[PDB]
Amino acid sequence: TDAVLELPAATFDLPLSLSGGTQTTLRAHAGHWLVIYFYPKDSTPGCTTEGLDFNALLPEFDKAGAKILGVSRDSVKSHDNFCAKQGFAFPLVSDGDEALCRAFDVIKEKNMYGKQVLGIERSTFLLSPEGQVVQAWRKVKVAGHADAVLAALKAHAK
Ligand code: NA
């Protein structure tokens, strides 16, 4: 009833490779809020702006007990390099096989170049402490976005 998206049960048990070398799963985040933001490519202008915006708000997300995860299909090494250069203090998921992306339906198609072209669409989601996807943002406008996500989280957490 409060969910805006339904994920396959197996999604919650997928091993998610993180920057820094560990793995997590969505089920492992039970009991707290989780922000999951998908972005198309490490170390590009919009993706860097977005990451830095979430990073600046980390104390506010902490106040609410929430954790953040950024997601792209870049490698663990790429993610480590991106985190170190930018000073990110939250983890990035290396979704190399796009399993997490597909679960959240963020791989979108565009008819371009006389081809059917698939790519990550910038998207963010709020996962409740009980594992429900309760809010979504798709075709994300980076400017103002992290602020909007924080505000929505606060409104939901009540
Ligand atoms: Na970088």
Ligand code: NA
């Ligand atoms: Na959660």
